[PDB]
Amino acid sequence: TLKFANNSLLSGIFLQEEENNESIVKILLGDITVPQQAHLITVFTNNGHVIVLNYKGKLVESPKHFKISLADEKLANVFHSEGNYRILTTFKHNSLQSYRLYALTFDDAKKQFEVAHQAEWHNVILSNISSNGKLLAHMCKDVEHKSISVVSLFDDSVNLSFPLGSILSSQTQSLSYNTRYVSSMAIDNMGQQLAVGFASGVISIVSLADLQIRLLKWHIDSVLSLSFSHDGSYLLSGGWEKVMSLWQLETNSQQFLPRLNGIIIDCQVLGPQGNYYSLILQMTENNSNSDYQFLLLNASDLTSKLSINGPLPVFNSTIKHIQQPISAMNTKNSNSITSLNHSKKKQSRKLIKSRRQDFTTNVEINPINKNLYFPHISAVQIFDFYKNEQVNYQYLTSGVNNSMGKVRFELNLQDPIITDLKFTKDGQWMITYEIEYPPNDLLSSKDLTHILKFWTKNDNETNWNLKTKVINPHGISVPITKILPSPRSVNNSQGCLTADNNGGLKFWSFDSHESNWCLKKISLPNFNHFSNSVSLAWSQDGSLIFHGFDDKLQILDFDTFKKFESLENTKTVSEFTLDSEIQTVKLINDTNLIVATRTTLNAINLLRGQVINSFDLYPFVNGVYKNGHMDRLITCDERTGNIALVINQQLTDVPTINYKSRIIIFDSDLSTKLGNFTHHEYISWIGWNYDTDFIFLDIESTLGVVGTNSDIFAEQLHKLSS
Amino acid sequence: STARPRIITSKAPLLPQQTTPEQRYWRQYTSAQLVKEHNSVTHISFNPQHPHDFAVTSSTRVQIFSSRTRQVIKTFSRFKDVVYSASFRSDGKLLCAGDATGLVSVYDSYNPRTILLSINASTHPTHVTKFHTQDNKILATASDDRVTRLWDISNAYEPQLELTGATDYVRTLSFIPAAPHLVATGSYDGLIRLYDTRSSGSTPIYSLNHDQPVENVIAVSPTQIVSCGGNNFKVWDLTSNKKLYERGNFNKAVTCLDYVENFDSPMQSALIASSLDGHVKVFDPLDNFQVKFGWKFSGPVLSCAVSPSTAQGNRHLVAGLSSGLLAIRTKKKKSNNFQRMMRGSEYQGDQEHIIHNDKVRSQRRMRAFERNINQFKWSEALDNAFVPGMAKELTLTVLQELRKRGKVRVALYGRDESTLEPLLNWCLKGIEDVRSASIVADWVAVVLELYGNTLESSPVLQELMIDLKTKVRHEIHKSKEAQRIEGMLQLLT
Amino acid sequence: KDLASATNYVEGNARVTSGDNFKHVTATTTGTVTVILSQALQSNDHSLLETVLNNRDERVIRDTIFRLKPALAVILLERLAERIARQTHRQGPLNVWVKWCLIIHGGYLVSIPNLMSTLSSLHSTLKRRSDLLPRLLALDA
Amino acid sequence: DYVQVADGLMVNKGNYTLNVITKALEDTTDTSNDHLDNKAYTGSDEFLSQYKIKAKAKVMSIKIDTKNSLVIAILQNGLIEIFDFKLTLLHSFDISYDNLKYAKWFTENGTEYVFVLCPLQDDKVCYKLLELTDCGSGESSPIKELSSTIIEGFSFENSKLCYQFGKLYKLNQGKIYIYSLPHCQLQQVIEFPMVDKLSPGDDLISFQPVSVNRVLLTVNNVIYLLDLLHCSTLSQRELTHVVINSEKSHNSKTIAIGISTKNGPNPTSSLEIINIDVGTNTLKDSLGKSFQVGNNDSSVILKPLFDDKDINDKRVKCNDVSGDSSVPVLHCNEVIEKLSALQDNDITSFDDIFFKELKIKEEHYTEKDRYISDPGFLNKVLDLIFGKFPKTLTFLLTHPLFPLSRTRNLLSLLRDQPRLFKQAIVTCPNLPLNELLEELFSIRNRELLLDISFRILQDFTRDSIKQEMKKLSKLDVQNFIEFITSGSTQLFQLLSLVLDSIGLFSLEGALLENLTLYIDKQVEIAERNTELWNLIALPTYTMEYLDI
RNA sequence: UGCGAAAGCAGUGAAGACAAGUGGCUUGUCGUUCGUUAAAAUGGCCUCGUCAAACGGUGGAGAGAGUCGCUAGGUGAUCGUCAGAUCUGCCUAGUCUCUAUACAGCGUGUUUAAUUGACAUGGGUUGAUGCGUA
């Protein structure tokens, strides 16, 4: 791996807290400084840098990088063949970009690539290039409607232009705009057939010799990705159903790959003889983020050779110009053919104008092997960050999460949402709570169901066996506002404590005589008020519980599971009403405990039954977090401190898109700010991994940490046996 | 890519008095044969060694039944009073029978014609006779003379020990299974006396005070014995000399006991007890002797046994009643040229360097509703749901998969009068049960929402809706009055 | 199986339950049947439990429970809760037997400390039979 | 970190015994014992002894006197045993043990040869240590530990003359430099305000704490890290903490130099020669439920004001999430001045209390979250307004809108204004169930009943409500039910609460039939209104016309 | 959209361009813009091995047949003024008796427990006009 932040050699290109739009846009395998000599790649970035990097051996002390001279464009992609090189660029009323092709040379002085400016197209709706980079088709949009044109970009062998009313059917010009909306296109290497996949779902292979079309109808929803094979006899196609189909274009026979756990937004054949297929899965279950799983697979048995995935969190709302992809309709997991500009404008105004800049997540650490579990929608991504690659993926609920590709009207469902999972402190059990949502338009559309599950596994394997599941924990139609594992004293850490929003508690623990995870204790007050500002703490003796309901931080025993009352009444304070709704009751050691509400942040000793220190939270968390997210905001240690974690929305000369993160650790009951650090991007989650460090998750999901004749003959023989 | 995950059956939360694995295993003892003997079946024992036969003592005849066909194979008729006890030796080679004249006749097993010897014991009826479990040449016979005896079967004229010291009607022997000097006898004055045989033998070494007159005493472990008499059995540690469990879960007196160990069962060891009231019950001596299953027969059950720990075949449970009859319940267990041509198909690669293995293990066969859902035939999934002999949780689970997965209206578009009647005909029964009533609710809700005009036109389902309304009225009456009982239980807090 | 293959959810043989099993924490009346019931509940006798409560004359039920001992009235409630949990068509003539023994032995089972725990089969039976009321209210509406 | 404090030789026995503990007594010949009685013969007494043990059978005890050795005494049959002398100064602190456990010739001067528990038993002489002023016996792997004001420290086991540790530990002549409750450490209780527990396996200090109060004589009990300490100039005996399965309540250890508190159990009644009263009745150190009782060793409370995330380039706040105000500056000197400003000449006015407190809390007078406050200060100023002066309009309306009132709420029934009591229901966030119940059952048939039912049903748990509304008369619930029948939802469920708390049997007939008639009509109309809420082709021959 | 609990409480436009129908008019649309916190083109998901027989755990409304045997009901035909008859009235539910737990589901690769056995996993010709047991 060649990390950007591991050297100043190209971290000077981007380190900025706001201006980080700079992106790598092409990778070539040769060398553009000198030809004919390859173990090293040349990366083209979207501004004009041409960085020659080495990946064989150790990374050098200086790259071979240049920066081409340009006009104000933005470097869409580069094209490479025998000798010649072209490059594509974008321009500037109707909002559509314009494309422009240049050619590159290098010979005279070794910093400058002379461009040559072949061709220009002044409005482009859509563009695609052949798999060898020998031709590119595009749309032009000159007026009554659009028009499609193919150009060849390394020689003047083919160019043609024609209106897509001559492509389109005559029966479709009385139909919806889904039946006329080209959402993907493709070309072959000879320029003889061009595939146009619309948004209604059908594909149309026009023959570029004379414009006669052949229709291929399989996709019941929109088409998102197409490619031709190298010989032009097979057509990869992919859309909203997570089925990579490949069309045998002689007799029109599909071969299906049906459950790809992500919708296909790009597919192309890769090898010389077409042995691998590279695909991109957009993973549309969480709409809070656009997270793409990259995947190649070999064509032989269609097994995923080398799938590639980052960490997959699910934020509270959408983040930064994150658009769910197009479809035939508008639903909760896509946006329609029209509503894309509407919802990017609405989400931009929700970022600028609105109040709830709340983009935090829940993440756990397995206390055995320290890998972190990102709860996805109805699933978990187990990901270990010592080598930053996903262990595996596991669906945990009984949804249609995998047994059906979801399309137009049935995209309007959503899976059970994994809202809580926590490990028991011995690492041998995983407690999980998720909310089954019902579908609409029937009698039971109003009542969610709540499911709590207890899973176990031995340490060798990578999936979790269910042991039992309680449905309707705490009664019917009530949530669990906070679950808590036990400290290692009450059942050798095989106990759990679940809190309602009616102030009720339940104690669930493992017994062996009845080999299951069952219910021991209960405390049920039925008020007629409800509030999701519930929090919990447990004393490491396994003795007293700290039930932080709204305004009511009660103290419960663990003998009889009721309110802490001593007959001598020696100021046995069993109640700390604070000023507002509390959201963190985090105990650090057995002595004291740090509480945080939406206004302030207190510390309270219990071998000295009163308050000790205070800090403000009102100018930082006013209402900018949901009532219940401060515990995944801030955390503690078992011994040596706690960590506040605040967020500043950086503003112009009205607040703007970008943020900065200010983290501050105090040690041992709020005494001294021994750590004050600022990172470039909004931060979502911090936690204590179990070797006295604290790890955090960014909003561009980067995990971070805060912590303490002979040799001549030999070389010639190894070069001849190479 | 992935394998398509199966359709999960709909398991609703569990209910009390469910099937424990122990009662599952015991409940599959079926096909209860009855045999009408002539008189009350006093005693029944099993062959030990190849334990495949059991000797049943009716009056004046001992019948060895076999455990492959459950009929009498051999019979012993030549007694002169009522025969009382019949037991096989530890090796199974010979059989002792105590008589009502005090004449312990030992035959050989599997030959009723050779009386091997005949002990003239005491003048009163000898009632319990059994060989040593560790030794093979001493025989314990206790009589209505309040004295048990250890005879040597070489010297059958005088007993090698004469265990006196009792006060009323000794009826039971046992031996302690590790220490072979220790004889635990039991009499009608409680008082499980037990004797070390190295000593004098006229005085027990200690006495275990059962209150009621004991009827049986067995030994479970080397260290704990179980004595039954009166309404209860009491278990006794011999070392600590101490009663440490008791069960009195019967109505009438416990007649007899026995015990199995390490046989093929979820229950590791089992103590079954027979108690004069129809009931024979099994207790699990690992989780503190709790009852786990029980049978009820048509009289006072006077003696019971089960086939021993190494039966290796047809596993039997027999109970002989005092009515004169007997009940048995069992659990049951091309050419050379062509082969030389097609030889190596049995190989599996012992000497082979690499071994590849990608043959997928063939799963369960998908049912009709599951494969219709997997092919997205939703109306056909409903048609396949409402076939006659279908399981009720299977109909429930396909209703749940149609409801959650897709859209009930989509599954319910092309219907009419004859193709809606199976749905509502199931909804009549399915609105009863609590596991199904909410799904039946929103299913019938959307079907009346889609088919309102057929309730005008077709009169074949008008009265179907009427009788559905009556069943909803019934179950909402029960679902309100149960809330009333919940309130008057909340008042009693 | 593949390494990019997501692990499918399967329940296996996991136990599913609810949040309501709290299983842990001179003659002049009638000639009734109450010695039948007491020596049925001392044992665990389904046959003559069924012959002592297929009878549904309400006053014989009443003075049967009155003549019944308080020490096995609670286990009578346990057997009754189990069987109306199993057979839902038995909730008619058998919640008579439960609305009497709550009434007749009033002090004993309000002195017993955990009625919810030792009768959580009855808690779960009534809570399940009565939590689905508003749905069939909407249905018959 | 104190414990439950009150009360102001075989050492593991109980009462019902003759004499299980013998000790030397002050201003007598030598010694005595106690009862709950046996003989106390001459075991070669009449010396300068002060300390006492026995040989752990109560049949062969020892009168450990200044003889340099000892004999076996006679208090079980009368028959003596044989003796021997090793050292020759004073055996006045002898600790005789069981069968070869820990016995050695430790007289007064660090000359302990190894030996065993018999008359002539002996072994190799381990007198090469320091003349330690703190030489004692412990039972972790049975040993003797010796720390010296010649400064030194050492540890040697009485099993194989097994010297395990030796260094220099400069402990001073403190009050009690005695081994801890589990004995792994040595708590050196310093004289005036201090006690340090030092790790007695490597001569290293583990916790040097201060003391809470005055204390002279302490004894570490059978606890985790706990001792009991009594004062010099007083009979005050408390317990402090820094057998573990069923705690040790009485007669586990004893050392006490208060006012004659000898043989100190919890019930330390049967003293040695005193025969006086007793004291505290606690157990040993429990797990974590003693923490709120023993909240001592620091009584230095003060007022914590609201601090901040401290200012270092804090002008770069970057769109602070507050409404319009940017920084609330805390003027606590001005708030302490507002206390003296409220203590001024507005005895029945509103110009020198009301607008003063509304100016030191600047808002729209019905809104919170403009907080710059302290609850002790607010309690004091609430008392300075409930003193010489509840007619105030601003301060006593804007701060019962405050979550920190601290039980100043008792006369909220005793004052009876319309609007002040309605606000006292719907805003005062501490208002107990006794006076809520009395205002619930002091009906004048008004809507304050409804608003007080909402508060009692949203604020308190049902068991705490029902055990308190046990404590009511019958005619208040009778006029309550007669109100509910004659002249509503929280009232319905509070009727359910009242009926559940009223008991089971002792009620009346026509009142119950009245509630029955009423409740059945309520059920029928609830059924029909829920029903309302849930309730919201071609022929072969026709004949029509066509236009002309 | 905002706020909140899972209930609910408040609040919902203008320009530009194009097409169609009748330079104008009228409507509809927008891979055009500003502001507000604001359904459809006959079109659906792969193979890699099936079958039979056991075994271990998990649930079960049990899967099904009887006995006019009890117990509670619900209801019908004809007659008969009703009383009451003939169908030895029918059905439901509970009970009583039974059986391979018959029922369903998950596994048995290594697991807390639990698996073995068949088969050339081809090609060819019929097999649908050759069937009555209604």
Walk me through this protein's architecture.
This is part of a larger assembly, with chains A (722 residues), B (493 residues), C (141 residues) and D (548 residues). Chain A is mainly β and 722 residues long. Chain A contains 5 helices and 52 strands. In chain A, the strands form 13 sheets. In chain A, strands 5, 6, 7, 8 and 9 form a 5-stranded antiparallel β-sheet that branches. In chain A, strands 1-2-3-4 form a 4-stranded antiparallel β-sheet, with no helix packed on it. A 4-stranded antiparallel β-sheet of chain A has the order 10-11-12-13. In chain A, a hairpin with a 4-residue loop joins strand 51 (693-698) and strand 52. The longest helix of chain A has 14 residues, at 339-352. Helix content of chain B is 22%, strand content 32%. Chain B has a 4-stranded antiparallel β-sheet with strand order 1-28-27-26, with no helix packed on it. Chain B has a 4-stranded antiparallel β-sheet with strand order 2-3-4-5, with no helix packed on it. Chain B has a 4-stranded antiparallel β-sheet with strand order 6-7-8-9, with no helix packed on it. In chain B, helix 4 packs antiparallel against helix 5 and helix 7 packs parallel to helix 10 (462-490). Chain C has helices at 35-41, 46-52, 58-67, 73-86, 91-104, 108-111, 115-118, 120-131, 133-140; one strand at 15-18. In chain C, helix 4 (73-86) packs antiparallel against helix 5 (91-104) and helix 4 packs parallel to helix 8 (120-131). Chain C starts with 14 loop residues before the first strand and ends with a helix. Chains A and D meet through strand 45, strand 47 and strand 48 of A and helix 7 of D. Strand 33 of chain A pairs parallel with strand 1 of chain C, so a sheet runs across the interface. Chain A binds one RNA strand of 134 nucleotides through strand 21 and helix 3. Chain B: One of its GO terms (cellular component) is t-UTP complex.
Write the layout of secondary structure elements.
The structure is cut from a larger assembly and holds chains A (722 residues), B (493 residues), C (141 residues) and D (548 residues).
Chain A: H1 8-11, E1 24-28, E2 40-45, E3 49-54, E4 66-67, E5 77-80, E6 85-90, E7 99-105, E8 114-115, E9 119-121, E10 127-129, E11 135-139, E12 147-152, E13 159-163, H2 164-167, E14 182-187, E15 193-198, E16 202-207, E17 212-217, E18 223-228, E19 234-239, E20 244-248, E21 253-257, E22 264-269, E23 276-281, E24 293-298, E25 307-308, H3 339-352, E26 364-365, E27 372-376, E28 379-384, E29 389-395, E30 417-423, E31 429-436, E32 449-456, E33 465-471, E34 482-485, E35 495-499, E36 505-511, E37 516-523, E38 535-538, E39 544-549, E40 552-557, E41 575-576, E42 582-584, E43 592-597, E44 600-605, E45 611-616, H4 630-633, E46 635-636, E47 642-651, E48 655-667, E49 672-679, E50 683-689, E51 693-698, E52 703-706, H5 710-720
Chain B: H1 21-27, E1 30-36, E2 43-46, E3 53-57, E4 62-66, E5 72-76, E6 83-88, E7 94-99, E8 103-108, E9 111-120, E10 126-131, E11 138-143, E12 148-152, E13 161-163, E14 170-172, E15 182-187, E16 190-196, E17 206-208, E18 216-219, E19 224-229, E20 232-237, E21 242-247, E22 256-261, E23 269-274, E24 279-284, E25 290-296, E26 301-306, E27 315-321, E28 325-331, H2 336-341, H3 368-374, H4 378-385, H5 392-405, H6 408-411, H7 417-430, H8 437-450, H9 452-457, H10 462-490
Antiparallel strand pairs in B: 1-28, 2-3, 3-4, 4-5, 6-7, 7-8, 8-9, 10-11, 11-12, 12-13, 14-15, 15-16, 16-17, 18-19, 19-20, 20-21, 22-23, 23-24, 24-25, 26-27, 27-28
Chain D: E1 22-24, E2 31-33, E3 134-138, E4 143-148, E5 152-157, E6 162-167, E7 176-179, E8 186-190, E9 194-199, E10 204-207, E11 217-220, E12 226-230, E13 237-241, H1 332-342, H2 354-359, H3 375-385, H4 395-398, H5 418-426, H6 433-440, H7 448-459, H8 462-468, H9 474-486, H10 489-501, H11 510-535
Antiparallel strand pairs in D: 1-2, 3-4, 4-5, 5-6, 7-8, 8-9, 9-10, 11-12, 12-13
Helix pairs in contact in D: 6-7, 8-10, 9-11
Chain A binds one RNA strand of 134 nucleotides through strand 21 and helix 3.
